[model samples]
Target chain A: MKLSARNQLAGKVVSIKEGAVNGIVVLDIGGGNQISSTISMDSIRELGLQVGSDAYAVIKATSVMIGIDDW
Target chain B: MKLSARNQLAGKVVSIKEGAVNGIVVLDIGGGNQISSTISMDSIRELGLQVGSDAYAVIKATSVMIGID
Candidate 1:
């Protein structure tokens, strides 16, 4: 499917932390920067995401949290 | 409307760079770290995103990519 959001990072599933409703899928996008994506449990299953599974982290600028260290 | 994605960040529009098809939206979520979201012009218009608009960046984890060093 085509999405408006850009920023597609290719990575592999390093770990899957499943909760009752939501699951946090961690991806090793290389450079030790593992991005954590909280997907629905159903989506987790639908993607069949597991250790070593390759997937793309599709992110839009709208969803990305831009913060600074100076609080 | 509800989205299947999980990560939702509250921010304000700092800048918006539009192209023919895609546009880059920058937000200042406090501090100096700015998050940029590249979205389509259609979505931008739909959301009425502007440089001073306040909105939420809704994201689904499924769309998020995971990687390691």
Candidate 2:
């Protein structure tokens, strides 16, 4: 399916840390680089994400922040 | 300053598409990979972002969505 979001990193679920309502799902995107996403527990269950499960970290352009180091 | 976002891709501003209130900023994060961000015009001015400006595309874990395809 086509997605509007620009950043789509395909990776495997490496870890999951559950919280009260939301949870943190970490994906290993190769080259030792990993991406972490915080989603609702419902979504976590809906996606059936587990360790070694293949998934994509979807991020929208509007959700991104532009940061400069030198203050 | 430290940020809560886990995805920090260092890149330079490559393009800027302006709108009425918000604008889209595109950053080229090496390897021909570019990231786009939609922010307010006020923020655009506050950040003083321009073409070739050095910046980073910061995204929080909460802002990220997990998709299966």
Candidate 3:
């Protein structure tokens, strides 16, 4: 499905760290860059994500914030 | 102050679209890549952000999701 999120990084699921309620899905988006996504455990099971599986790191534009070094 | 957000992309404020309550802050993160952030108007004023100002696009890891094609 098409997403409105600005960032849609395609990569493979390299590792997963599970928690009681939430989990962290680490994706290797090539170029030695990896993106870590923290999602609900329920979503994790629903998505059927696994190691070596391809996925996309989705982040909405609204979630982004502007920061200055001086701050 | 330090942030726990995983992504901290440094860029410049290229443009801003203002609204009654919230506004869109667009940052040109070089390499022709830009990130758009929707924040409150109060924050806009508080940050004193303007065109051509250097800033960062910060996003928390929890705010990110996983999608597959």
Candidate 4:
């Protein structure tokens, strides 16, 4: 089955931390950079992703919002 | 200083393809799985992410929703 394959990045599941409602999938893209994403509980089970598991964090371009931090 | 450090996924920017308005960042996460993401033109400049530049894609957990095919 083709999953559309959006936001394809070559990274590993740095950590699969459990959240209150769902699980937080962390993808460390090296260079001290990391993408913290949230996934559904069912997705965790379906994807069979665990700590150290290699997986791509799929996201739509439009879904990404840009913001600036105030100091 | 910390950047909140959310969704820490270890991935690489597979491809930094360009789009009409923004650039499409493709991350080929092993297993033939690839994530095609779109970033603003400014983001591309701020992040300084290139085709092979190591960068992380940060997203919020609540921002993620469940879907099925």
lDDT of 3 by residue, A1-71 (tens): 76657888899999999865457899999999999997656578999999999999888877778998995
What does candidate 2's lDDT look like per residue over A1-70, in tens digits?
9999999999999998776566778899988999878677899999899999999989897677655565
Regions of model 2 farther than 4 Å from truth: A68-71, B1-69
Model 1's DockQ?
Answer: 0.03
Question: What are the clash counts of all predictions, listed in order?
Answer: 20, 0, 0, 32
lDDT of 4 by residue, A1-71 (tens): 55664666657888776644466678877777788776666788799988888877677765655555745
Determine the C-alpha RMSD for candidate 4 after optimal superposition of all C-alphas: 17.6
TM-scores of all predicted structures: 0.48, 0.48, 0.49, 0.43
**Candidate 1 regions with alpha-carbon error over 4 angstroms:** B1-69
- TM-score, chain B, each candidate: 0.78, 0.88, 0.90, 0.67
**Docking level of model 3:** incorrect
- For residues B13-54, what per-residue lDDT tens digits would candidate 1 score against the true structure? 989997654578998877676788976565789999999899
How far out, in Å, is residue A34 in model 1? 0.6
Chain A accuracy as TM-score for every candidate: 0.85, 0.86, 0.85, 0.72
